[PDB]
Amino acid sequence: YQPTPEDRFTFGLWTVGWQGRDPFGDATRRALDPVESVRRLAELGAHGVTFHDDDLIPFGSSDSEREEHVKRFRQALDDTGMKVPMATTNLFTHPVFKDGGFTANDRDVRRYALRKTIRNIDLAVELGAETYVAWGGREGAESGGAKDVRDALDRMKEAFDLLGEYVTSQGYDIRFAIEPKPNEPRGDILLPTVGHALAFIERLERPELYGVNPEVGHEQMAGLNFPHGIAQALWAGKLFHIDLNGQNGIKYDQDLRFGAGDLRAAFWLVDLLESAGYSGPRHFDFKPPRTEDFDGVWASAAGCMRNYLILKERAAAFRADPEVQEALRASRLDELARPTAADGLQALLDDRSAFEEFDVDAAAARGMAFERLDQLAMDHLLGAR
Amino acid sequence: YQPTPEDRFTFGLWTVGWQGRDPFGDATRRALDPVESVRRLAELGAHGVTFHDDDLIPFGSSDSEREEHVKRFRQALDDTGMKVPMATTNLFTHPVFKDGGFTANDRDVRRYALRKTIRNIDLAVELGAETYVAWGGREGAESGGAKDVRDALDRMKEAFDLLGEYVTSQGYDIRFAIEPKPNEPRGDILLPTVGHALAFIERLERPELYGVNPEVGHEQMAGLNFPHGIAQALWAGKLFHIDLNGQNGIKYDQDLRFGAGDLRAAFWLVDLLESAGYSGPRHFDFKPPRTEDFDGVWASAAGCMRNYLILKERAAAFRADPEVQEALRASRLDELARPTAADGLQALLDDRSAFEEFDVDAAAARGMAFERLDQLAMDHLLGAR
Amino acid sequence: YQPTPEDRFTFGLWTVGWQGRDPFGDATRRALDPVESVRRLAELGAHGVTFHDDDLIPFGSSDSEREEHVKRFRQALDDTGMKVPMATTNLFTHPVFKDGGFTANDRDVRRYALRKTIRNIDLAVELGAETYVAWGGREGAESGGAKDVRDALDRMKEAFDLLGEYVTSQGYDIRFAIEPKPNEPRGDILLPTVGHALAFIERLERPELYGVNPEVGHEQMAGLNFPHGIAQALWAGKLFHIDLNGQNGIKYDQDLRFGAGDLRAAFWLVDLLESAGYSGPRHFDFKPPRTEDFDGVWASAAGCMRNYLILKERAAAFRADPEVQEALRASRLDELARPTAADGLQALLDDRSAFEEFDVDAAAARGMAFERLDQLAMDHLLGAR
Amino acid sequence: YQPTPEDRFTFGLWTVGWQGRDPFGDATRRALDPVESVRRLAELGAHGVTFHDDDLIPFGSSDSEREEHVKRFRQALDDTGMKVPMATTNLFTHPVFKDGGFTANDRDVRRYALRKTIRNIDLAVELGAETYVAWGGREGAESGGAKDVRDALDRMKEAFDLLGEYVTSQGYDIRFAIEPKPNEPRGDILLPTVGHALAFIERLERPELYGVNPEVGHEQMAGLNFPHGIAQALWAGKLFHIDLNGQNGIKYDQDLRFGAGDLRAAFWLVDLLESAGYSGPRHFDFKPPRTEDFDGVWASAAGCMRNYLILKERAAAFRADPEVQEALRASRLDELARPTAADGLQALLDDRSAFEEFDVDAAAARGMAFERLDQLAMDHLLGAR
Ligand SMILES: O=C[C@H](O)[C@@H](O)[C@H](O)CO
Ligand SMILES: O=C[C@H](O)[C@@H](O)[C@H](O)CO
Ligand SMILES: O=C[C@H](O)[C@@H](O)[C@H](O)CO
Ligand SMILES: O=C[C@H](O)[C@@H](O)[C@H](O)CO
Ligand SMILES: [Mg+2]
Ligand SMILES: [Mg+2]
Ligand SMILES: [Mg+2]
Ligand SMILES: [Mg+2]
Ligand SMILES: [Mg+2]
Ligand SMILES: [Mg+2]
Ligand SMILES: [Mg+2]
Ligand SMILES: [Mg+2]
């Protein structure tokens, strides 16, 4: 179960670089230089890394320091063959973003947020990123009268429209991906789920430039089924990127390593990506727990990759088993794929076998045989066939 | 706080008519005749009622019995002046719908479901309903391999497209409203939230015919902010109807009377509907608890109405208070309503006050004064001004 | 992975006998005769069955019909070698229990509830049950003013004290087990968790007669860690029985087969029971989903058993691996088992190495190596060693 | 609604002193000197303050600096008449406590934790505190194999036993209060709820010295009913202190001002404390949101107090209304307070009216009239009588 760069595994600098500060505790680890993270990830078999502007260039850096930070990063990429497929902006840490970036009540803040983003899109393109993520962590409220949501969505739409006009004007080959989350750090965050982000996109001036970057733990914080949310994004043709991690239910965002948290959900996710032929990066947005030292950091990052490869093997064995293919037919998955009324509305209306002469009792008595199917899936996941 | 028909309060027959059967207990009340519900609601000040096909005409009724059930209902409407603004289909109770209606794996079931719906649309129009609701309570799964979601969404789209072709062909003046719910009775239900339903609509053949019918308790079962979800639907121009009730957090669907559950959320909802000028029915989808007799039923239905009118008064007092209008300006709600960059992209790019010369520290130090605003809202709700 | 009666697997009659009625749907299966369930379970390798009074003898049965129901049951037990290790009372289905049994506001109801229970304790003893379970599903409220909790706990204590006086007076060899649940069917249920039940026991007249019967899905409906709750019950010496099933988070009670739901939690539970030497029945309180026919029922019941045996094998392989034993020492599990200050308070107070000369920085820098340990556990569960 | 010191309102230094650092953002406010907090709270009408050792004396302070910090604090108390009714220890912030204090795997850590606590008990007594709180925020785990819970509870018991031996030996007049929380910052925390803490106490060497300090938001993070949990603690005679705040459901700990979050729950809590004659401090453990400046801090602290006094007035009006007293009798709250069988077991057994001749149907048909009662409570809370 050894990863290789062909597996397309990616990590954010902020993941293995998290120092361990939480709401109740100080850092337990020293800061990592981005150059060291690049080398250590390459050695483990990763394909590439991602960054927020502030992870690479310290907030308030002069143009000089900015250039120095970039050249050193670029050298590490050349030395290792590591790529940078995605980048994003930090519109959450600095106190000026306390009420949001794109939807802050103060207009001056809103203009500042757009300028900070634009500057990072230029860098992203230079580094060859294909996707630019937006996670609006501060866009939201703790109280009802603090934010008029209709006005807030108008401001959010205005922000994304301007960003689309910018990339178009520049002739850049980059697409945007909105990353939803239901709460934390704000009491409620705008565009809380995959569904809300999808619906919003459809009201932008050039919808083709925007998709979603869903995260396992985010949808789970609302108690939702992650693989179902992913299938809806695929169905809409909007899965531009994905963030993998673990979460144990509805509580604070834990960001466990991928595989931890809801293991069966992880199995069904892998099945789906591999089946649908998803060809983007397999990105890990996680935090090695603050109980660990540096050895523990690298062990947790390696586990992310190892769990995906184990699940891949098991899902493929499941789909290739003749006994499973038979079970799928027993549960009528084949019939779910056929059109309900390719014959058309008139034909359906005239068809007595669809109503007047439909035997409801006989249909009702047919078992779906879902429990035998699910046990085959359990046996495969556990390697107990 | 006396309701009148001009308040547009409506109730489903299945609400005050719920007999009290739950997963662990038998009925505690006898069945109510729809004619009696119509008269008792009219006396309390309701404007109208709604129904599922099966609430009015017992499943498996001959055409004769069907006609008799309708004429008796129609007489009660004429006697009382009660209207029927919405109707829906029961695609959940009968065992044949155990794996869904529109997205059942069995194709024959799927065709049956469409025929049962069509028959009810005709009735709805005859009764003068303006909105037809679809709640797909059985569309979903308990296990991962039982339903291919991509195929399921193709079948769901096919169903709604055929329904749109039908109403168009007939020349009917009716629109559809999809009612989301995250779980219960299925382990996970497809189109779980307001957001997922909005996104789906945009992929139908004639999106203009479809909106949402959100329910307070449904979004709360995912831990989401109901007033925020409503504002997104209004922003999209898709709030065709609304279901009011109460829910105490993330647990089974309680369907308490409106006002019970999350009271502050109810306050912010009323504020929003009244402010935005929502002109549809104020519909109550609730269940008088099984602890009550008939007197308790009517007391609970009356409380639904009374709580909405109390909240209306308080929200209006809040918005009309000079001290609140001042607080809104103090928290920059006025600035949230102004365009970020009406000057355009070039202008923004050239503006040094937006970045190069933006004083981030001064901006950061400005308090938002949200806590004083929220206490004014608390004082108003409690009548403690 | 074939079960045998020596594995101590037990099932309630109400499990494989659930007809499939839910809050939104009619039954999908016909009723099963208890005699048939006994034979079919024996064939699958079960050790025994359990019952509520009403599962075996229909409510309102004459003494004659009662005797007939018992003798037929007893014959099936003799024919198969099946045992009955636990029984309970139905104080939830009948409308008279709408506000509770032991804590109903009406005193007459409360006296009725005690009499119905006593009659079943006699039957239980005759059948050789060792444990009598109490699940107070209707003890609770939907509204704040409906129940004074202090008074309700006085009534609950009075009920259990009388039951203890009864068994003592009769000379019966039976112990009681309280089964907690946080909600459903009541808005809130009294004694919501394992912790609340443990605390209550300590205020009864003869605490030695009472323990807990925790259920996987029940603690998960509060988002709690099931294996941690079990360890506290074991620590107190109160784990008299256990109910196994599956649940996907905080939502309605799903009662999935054991192994489904939170698989890692199931792994850690098995580890704990086997390690601690729990010697009671492994009881399954679950419901085959309403999508299944009879073949699906028996497949789901067999899966319960199969998953426990797979998990048992994996947990035992984990604990026996030399590499894991080393990892446990690396994470200082050995030191967690040693007394903090066997030297005593004075010694601790005088020890400079415990404070004045304690090197906090050196201690802080020591990694706990928990992530490597957890990956060994993942590898073992998945059979990927 | 003006508070006075006779209202017994108290605040932790860490509340109004929270700088606004969260998992995703830097501080938005400067640090407050404890002396300034004391004066500003006194001016608002507070009765007193509480502290963790580290809030008053910076970690690693020399004995000299320690004395200076104390004398300055003591002067502010004398100048204002403010009292200090409770104190606690910080066993969570410093990296050395990354795996816990009392239940850290490393034995040396465990001994350090006890010494740090003891030193603070001495200070607490000198300042005249009556209650010493223990919140074990780091006692727990993110993974199953990292902590053996049975061993962890043995270590927790050992810690509290030593603390009880210490206060006894010293002749101190102080009692301990354990403050439960279900998660955050650890994936799962030991003693997660009020129930688990109550059960644990009963296994300590001198149970009379220990009670609970429950917090509104903590029980709500498990979806539990706070007023019900409080009634159980009162029933056991263990409510030594209480922490008031607000929380909007199952998510991260928000620590909103009291009154915000679940308003009806706040109403029922006030009713209960006032009815039961709770005479301890009304302590606020909350955080003014990071969106606020100093003016916003003091406005939020004042709102805590104002909401309690409004709720007090409304609950008292509710209980004093003749119409409510009648409703309580209609719902049989009077009968819930009478013994079920003061006549004894024999009498109950011989009573035919309790079973043989009990009319179950007549009893079942009696409505509980809970909905009318709950609407009277709503009308009172809203001042709409
Ligand atoms: O909740 C935080 C997000 O997951 C963050 O990692 C985004 O991906 C980056 O802005
Ligand atoms: O969860 C059930 C729904 O709320 C139901 O009332 C729909 O509105 C009608 O099909
Ligand atoms: O939630 C219902 C319970 O789990 C039930 O099965 C009890 O065990 C029997 O009274
Ligand atoms: O969750 C944190 C606690 O509520 C904290 O305030 C304790 O009261 C103090 O140790
Ligand atoms: Mg996250
Ligand atoms: Mg992310
Ligand atoms: Mg509902
Ligand atoms: Mg509804
Ligand atoms: Mg259950
Ligand atoms: Mg059970
Ligand atoms: Mg807290
Ligand atoms: Mg606290």
PDB file of N, CA, C and O in Angstrom, chain B residues 257 259 289 291-293 300 306-307 310 314 367-371 374-375 378-379 381-384, chain D residues 257 259 289 291-293 300 306-307 310 314 367-371 374-375 378-379 381-384:
ATOM      1  N   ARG B 257     -46.192  22.720  18.028  1.00  0.00           N
ATOM      2  CA  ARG B 257     -46.951  23.889  17.498  1.00  0.00           C
ATOM      3  C   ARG B 257     -45.928  25.045  17.214  1.00  0.00           C
ATOM      4  O   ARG B 257     -44.921  25.132  17.917  1.00  0.00           O
ATOM      5  N   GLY B 259     -44.016  28.321  17.348  1.00  0.00           N
ATOM      6  CA  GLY B 259     -43.694  29.139  18.544  1.00  0.00           C
ATOM      7  C   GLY B 259     -42.944  28.299  19.548  1.00  0.00           C
ATOM      8  O   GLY B 259     -42.081  28.840  20.250  1.00  0.00           O
ATOM      9  N   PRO B 289     -49.663  16.895  20.480  1.00  0.00           N
ATOM     10  CA  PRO B 289     -49.038  15.712  21.125  1.00  0.00           C
ATOM     11  C   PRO B 289     -50.102  14.686  21.486  1.00  0.00           C
ATOM     12  O   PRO B 289     -51.284  15.037  21.758  1.00  0.00           O
ATOM     13  N   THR B 291     -50.565  13.042  24.082  1.00  0.00           N
ATOM     14  CA  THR B 291     -51.107  13.263  25.423  1.00  0.00           C
ATOM     15  C   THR B 291     -52.452  14.037  25.386  1.00  0.00           C
ATOM     16  O   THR B 291     -53.137  13.978  26.491  1.00  0.00           O
ATOM     17  N   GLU B 292     -52.858  14.659  24.313  1.00  0.00           N
ATOM     18  CA  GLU B 292     -54.047  15.509  24.342  1.00  0.00           C
ATOM     19  C   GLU B 292     -55.341  14.831  23.818  1.00  0.00           C
ATOM     20  O   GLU B 292     -55.224  13.989  22.904  1.00  0.00           O
ATOM     21  N   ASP B 293     -56.407  15.395  24.435  1.00  0.00           N
ATOM     22  CA  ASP B 293     -57.766  14.953  23.859  1.00  0.00           C
ATOM     23  C   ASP B 293     -58.135  16.005  22.836  1.00  0.00           C
ATOM     24  O   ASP B 293     -57.386  16.916  22.434  1.00  0.00           O
ATOM     25  N   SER B 300     -54.102  23.622  20.760  1.00  0.00           N
ATOM     26  CA  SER B 300     -52.762  23.650  20.085  1.00  0.00           C
ATOM     27  C   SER B 300     -52.821  24.349  18.765  1.00  0.00           C
ATOM     28  O   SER B 300     -51.911  25.176  18.388  1.00  0.00           O
ATOM     29  N   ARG B 306     -51.884  32.298  17.341  1.00  0.00           N
ATOM     30  CA  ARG B 306     -51.652  33.287  18.418  1.00  0.00           C
ATOM     31  C   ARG B 306     -50.139  33.603  18.452  1.00  0.00           C
ATOM     32  O   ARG B 306     -49.768  34.778  18.438  1.00  0.00           O
ATOM     33  N   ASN B 307     -49.320  32.547  18.462  1.00  0.00           N
ATOM     34  CA  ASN B 307     -47.840  32.848  18.474  1.00  0.00           C
ATOM     35  C   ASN B 307     -47.387  33.605  17.295  1.00  0.00           C
ATOM     36  O   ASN B 307     -46.532  34.546  17.436  1.00  0.00           O
ATOM     37  N   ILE B 310     -48.431  37.338  17.866  1.00  0.00           N
ATOM     38  CA  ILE B 310     -47.623  37.974  18.958  1.00  0.00           C
ATOM     39  C   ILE B 310     -46.275  38.330  18.306  1.00  0.00           C
ATOM     40  O   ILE B 310     -45.834  39.484  18.488  1.00  0.00           O
ATOM     41  N   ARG B 314     -44.344  42.083  17.843  1.00  0.00           N
ATOM     42  CA  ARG B 314     -42.984  42.355  18.444  1.00  0.00           C
ATOM     43  C   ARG B 314     -41.973  42.695  17.397  1.00  0.00           C
ATOM     44  O   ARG B 314     -41.134  43.628  17.644  1.00  0.00           O
ATOM     45  N   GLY B 367     -15.546  48.338  16.738  1.00  0.00           N
ATOM     46  CA  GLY B 367     -16.484  47.273  17.235  1.00  0.00           C
ATOM     47  C   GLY B 367     -17.700  47.249  16.322  1.00  0.00           C
ATOM     48  O   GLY B 367     -18.109  48.262  15.759  1.00  0.00           O
ATOM     49  N   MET B 368     -18.341  46.035  16.284  1.00  0.00           N
ATOM     50  CA  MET B 368     -19.549  45.970  15.394  1.00  0.00           C
ATOM     51  C   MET B 368     -20.826  46.347  16.192  1.00  0.00           C
ATOM     52  O   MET B 368     -21.840  46.481  15.467  1.00  0.00           O
ATOM     53  N   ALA B 369     -20.819  46.457  17.463  1.00  0.00           N
ATOM     54  CA  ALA B 369     -21.906  46.790  18.377  1.00  0.00           C
ATOM     55  C   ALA B 369     -23.126  45.843  18.208  1.00  0.00           C
ATOM     56  O   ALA B 369     -24.295  46.193  18.382  1.00  0.00           O
ATOM     57  N   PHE B 370     -22.783  44.597  17.824  1.00  0.00           N
ATOM     58  CA  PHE B 370     -23.872  43.563  17.632  1.00  0.00           C
ATOM     59  C   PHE B 370     -24.562  43.178  18.926  1.00  0.00           C
ATOM     60  O   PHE B 370     -25.759  42.790  18.875  1.00  0.00           O
ATOM     61  N   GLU B 371     -23.873  43.129  20.052  1.00  0.00           N
ATOM     62  CA  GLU B 371     -24.485  42.707  21.334  1.00  0.00           C
ATOM     63  C   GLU B 371     -25.533  43.705  21.827  1.00  0.00           C
ATOM     64  O   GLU B 371     -26.602  43.273  22.283  1.00  0.00           O
ATOM     65  N   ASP B 374     -28.509  43.090  19.600  1.00  0.00           N
ATOM     66  CA  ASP B 374     -29.239  41.835  19.991  1.00  0.00           C
ATOM     67  C   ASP B 374     -30.015  41.984  21.262  1.00  0.00           C
ATOM     68  O   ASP B 374     -31.091  41.343  21.468  1.00  0.00           O
ATOM     69  N   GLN B 375     -29.552  42.765  22.246  1.00  0.00           N
ATOM     70  CA  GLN B 375     -30.288  42.996  23.490  1.00  0.00           C
ATOM     71  C   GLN B 375     -31.545  43.849  23.208  1.00  0.00           C
ATOM     72  O   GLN B 375     -32.563  43.581  23.900  1.00  0.00           O
ATOM     73  N   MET B 378     -33.985  41.308  22.048  1.00  0.00           N
ATOM     74  CA  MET B 378     -34.437  40.521  23.178  1.00  0.00           C
ATOM     75  C   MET B 378     -35.505  41.366  23.947  1.00  0.00           C
ATOM     76  O   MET B 378     -36.556  40.780  24.287  1.00  0.00           O
ATOM     77  N   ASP B 379     -35.141  42.597  24.247  1.00  0.00           N
ATOM     78  CA  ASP B 379     -36.107  43.465  25.023  1.00  0.00           C
ATOM     79  C   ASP B 379     -37.448  43.562  24.279  1.00  0.00           C
ATOM     80  O   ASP B 379     -38.498  43.408  24.936  1.00  0.00           O
ATOM     81  N   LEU B 381     -38.683  41.439  21.990  1.00  0.00           N
ATOM     82  CA  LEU B 381     -39.420  40.144  21.974  1.00  0.00           C
ATOM     83  C   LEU B 381     -40.139  39.925  23.307  1.00  0.00           C
ATOM     84  O   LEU B 381     -41.294  39.400  23.306  1.00  0.00           O
ATOM     85  N   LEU B 382     -39.519  40.230  24.435  1.00  0.00           N
ATOM     86  CA  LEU B 382     -40.022  40.005  25.761  1.00  0.00           C
ATOM     87  C   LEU B 382     -41.007  41.120  26.248  1.00  0.00           C
ATOM     88  O   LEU B 382     -41.571  40.893  27.311  1.00  0.00           O
ATOM     89  N   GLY B 383     -41.116  42.133  25.466  1.00  0.00           N
ATOM     90  CA  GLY B 383     -42.026  43.287  25.840  1.00  0.00           C
ATOM     91  C   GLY B 383     -41.475  43.946  27.076  1.00  0.00           C
ATOM     92  O   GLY B 383     -42.245  44.350  28.010  1.00  0.00           O
ATOM     93  N   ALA B 384     -40.188  44.108  27.147  1.00  0.00           N
ATOM     94  CA  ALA B 384     -39.492  44.700  28.288  1.00  0.00           C
ATOM     95  C   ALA B 384     -38.847  46.034  27.942  1.00  0.00           C
ATOM     96  O   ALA B 384     -37.845  46.432  28.581  1.00  0.00           O
TER      97      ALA B 384
ATOM     98  N   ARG D 257     -24.104  35.066  25.667  1.00  0.00           N
ATOM     99  CA  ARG D 257     -24.586  35.653  26.949  1.00  0.00           C
ATOM    100  C   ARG D 257     -25.870  34.867  27.392  1.00  0.00           C
ATOM    101  O   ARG D 257     -26.605  34.395  26.524  1.00  0.00           O
ATOM    102  N   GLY D 259     -29.446  33.943  28.266  1.00  0.00           N
ATOM    103  CA  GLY D 259     -30.694  34.435  27.633  1.00  0.00           C
ATOM    104  C   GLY D 259     -30.655  34.159  26.150  1.00  0.00           C
ATOM    105  O   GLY D 259     -31.713  33.892  25.566  1.00  0.00           O
ATOM    106  N   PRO D 289     -18.685  38.139  22.034  1.00  0.00           N
ATOM    107  CA  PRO D 289     -18.179  37.721  20.702  1.00  0.00           C
ATOM    108  C   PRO D 289     -17.014  38.606  20.280  1.00  0.00           C
ATOM    109  O   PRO D 289     -16.928  39.803  20.672  1.00  0.00           O
ATOM    110  N   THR D 291     -16.381  40.009  17.580  1.00  0.00           N
ATOM    111  CA  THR D 291     -16.830  41.189  16.841  1.00  0.00           C
ATOM    112  C   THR D 291     -16.920  42.445  17.749  1.00  0.00           C
ATOM    113  O   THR D 291     -16.991  43.572  17.101  1.00  0.00           O
ATOM    114  N   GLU D 292     -16.891  42.356  19.050  1.00  0.00           N
ATOM    115  CA  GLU D 292     -17.133  43.529  19.888  1.00  0.00           C
ATOM    116  C   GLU D 292     -15.850  44.221  20.418  1.00  0.00           C
ATOM    117  O   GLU D 292     -14.861  43.500  20.663  1.00  0.00           O
ATOM    118  N   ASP D 293     -16.113  45.537  20.608  1.00  0.00           N
ATOM    119  CA  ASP D 293     -14.982  46.302  21.323  1.00  0.00           C
ATOM    120  C   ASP D 293     -15.348  46.288  22.791  1.00  0.00           C
ATOM    121  O   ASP D 293     -16.272  45.625  23.299  1.00  0.00           O
ATOM    122  N   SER D 300     -22.634  43.271  26.840  1.00  0.00           N
ATOM    123  CA  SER D 300     -22.959  41.807  26.899  1.00  0.00           C
ATOM    124  C   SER D 300     -23.046  41.315  28.308  1.00  0.00           C
ATOM    125  O   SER D 300     -23.974  40.514  28.696  1.00  0.00           O
ATOM    126  N   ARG D 306     -29.590  41.293  33.133  1.00  0.00           N
ATOM    127  CA  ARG D 306     -30.903  41.832  32.711  1.00  0.00           C
ATOM    128  C   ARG D 306     -31.795  40.638  32.300  1.00  0.00           C
ATOM    129  O   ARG D 306     -32.927  40.540  32.776  1.00  0.00           O
ATOM    130  N   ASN D 307     -31.244  39.758  31.459  1.00  0.00           N
ATOM    131  CA  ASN D 307     -32.102  38.577  31.070  1.00  0.00           C
ATOM    132  C   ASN D 307     -32.497  37.737  32.214  1.00  0.00           C
ATOM    133  O   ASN D 307     -33.685  37.268  32.275  1.00  0.00           O
ATOM    134  N   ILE D 310     -35.414  39.605  34.045  1.00  0.00           N
ATOM    135  CA  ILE D 310     -36.669  39.602  33.224  1.00  0.00           C
ATOM    136  C   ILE D 310     -37.281  38.204  33.430  1.00  0.00           C
ATOM    137  O   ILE D 310     -38.494  38.143  33.717  1.00  0.00           O
ATOM    138  N   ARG D 314     -41.050  37.050  35.007  1.00  0.00           N
ATOM    139  CA  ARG D 314     -42.047  36.265  34.187  1.00  0.00           C
ATOM    140  C   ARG D 314     -42.366  34.947  34.814  1.00  0.00           C
ATOM    141  O   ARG D 314     -43.579  34.543  34.793  1.00  0.00           O
ATOM    142  N   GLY D 367     -57.596  13.473  28.682  1.00  0.00           N
ATOM    143  CA  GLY D 367     -56.500  14.314  28.089  1.00  0.00           C
ATOM    144  C   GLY D 367     -55.656  14.866  29.228  1.00  0.00           C
ATOM    145  O   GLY D 367     -56.138  15.113  30.332  1.00  0.00           O
ATOM    146  N   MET D 368     -54.363  15.157  28.871  1.00  0.00           N
ATOM    147  CA  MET D 368     -53.498  15.706  29.968  1.00  0.00           C
ATOM    148  C   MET D 368     -53.583  17.256  29.997  1.00  0.00           C
ATOM    149  O   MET D 368     -53.022  17.763  30.997  1.00  0.00           O
ATOM    150  N   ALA D 369     -54.136  17.918  29.057  1.00  0.00           N
ATOM    151  CA  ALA D 369     -54.304  19.359  28.904  1.00  0.00           C
ATOM    152  C   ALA D 369     -52.952  20.120  28.993  1.00  0.00           C
ATOM    153  O   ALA D 369     -52.835  21.256  29.456  1.00  0.00           O
ATOM    154  N   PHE D 370     -51.907  19.403  28.536  1.00  0.00           N
ATOM    155  CA  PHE D 370     -50.527  20.026  28.551  1.00  0.00           C
ATOM    156  C   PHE D 370     -50.390  21.193  27.592  1.00  0.00           C
ATOM    157  O   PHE D 370     -49.560  22.098  27.866  1.00  0.00           O
ATOM    158  N   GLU D 371     -51.034  21.178  26.439  1.00  0.00           N
ATOM    159  CA  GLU D 371     -50.893  22.266  25.443  1.00  0.00           C
ATOM    160  C   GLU D 371     -51.484  23.584  25.943  1.00  0.00           C
ATOM    161  O   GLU D 371     -50.852  24.634  25.752  1.00  0.00           O
ATOM    162  N   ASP D 374     -48.956  24.834  28.443  1.00  0.00           N
ATOM    163  CA  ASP D 374     -47.747  25.411  27.761  1.00  0.00           C
ATOM    164  C   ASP D 374     -48.016  26.738  27.123  1.00  0.00           C
ATOM    165  O   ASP D 374     -47.114  27.627  27.023  1.00  0.00           O
ATOM    166  N   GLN D 375     -49.214  26.997  26.585  1.00  0.00           N
ATOM    167  CA  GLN D 375     -49.557  28.292  25.996  1.00  0.00           C
ATOM    168  C   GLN D 375     -49.662  29.364  27.103  1.00  0.00           C
ATOM    169  O   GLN D 375     -49.272  30.521  26.792  1.00  0.00           O
ATOM    170  N   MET D 378     -46.120  30.347  27.594  1.00  0.00           N
ATOM    171  CA  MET D 378     -45.682  31.154  26.474  1.00  0.00           C
ATOM    172  C   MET D 378     -46.234  32.601  26.688  1.00  0.00           C
ATOM    173  O   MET D 378     -45.439  33.547  26.502  1.00  0.00           O
ATOM    174  N   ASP D 379     -47.525  32.679  26.949  1.00  0.00           N
ATOM    175  CA  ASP D 379     -48.140  34.048  27.133  1.00  0.00           C
ATOM    176  C   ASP D 379     -47.410  34.814  28.247  1.00  0.00           C
ATOM    177  O   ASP D 379     -47.092  36.001  28.033  1.00  0.00           O
ATOM    178  N   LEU D 381     -44.302  34.287  29.399  1.00  0.00           N
ATOM    179  CA  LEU D 381     -42.909  34.656  29.018  1.00  0.00           C
ATOM    180  C   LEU D 381     -42.912  35.897  28.124  1.00  0.00           C
ATOM    181  O   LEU D 381     -42.003  36.769  28.273  1.00  0.00           O
ATOM    182  N   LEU D 382     -43.827  36.008  27.174  1.00  0.00           N
ATOM    183  CA  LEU D 382     -43.911  37.064  26.204  1.00  0.00           C
ATOM    184  C   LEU D 382     -44.623  38.348  26.746  1.00  0.00           C
ATOM    185  O   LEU D 382     -44.587  39.321  26.003  1.00  0.00           O
ATOM    186  N   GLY D 383     -45.149  38.231  27.912  1.00  0.00           N
ATOM    187  CA  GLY D 383     -45.883  39.402  28.536  1.00  0.00           C
ATOM    188  C   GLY D 383     -47.106  39.692  27.707  1.00  0.00           C
ATOM    189  O   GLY D 383     -47.469  40.891  27.461  1.00  0.00           O
ATOM    190  N   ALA D 384     -47.790  38.678  27.271  1.00  0.00           N
ATOM    191  CA  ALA D 384     -48.980  38.786  26.430  1.00  0.00           C
ATOM    192  C   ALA D 384     -50.238  38.318  27.147  1.00  0.00           C
ATOM    193  O   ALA D 384     -51.209  37.877  26.490  1.00  0.00           O
TER     194      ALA D 384
END
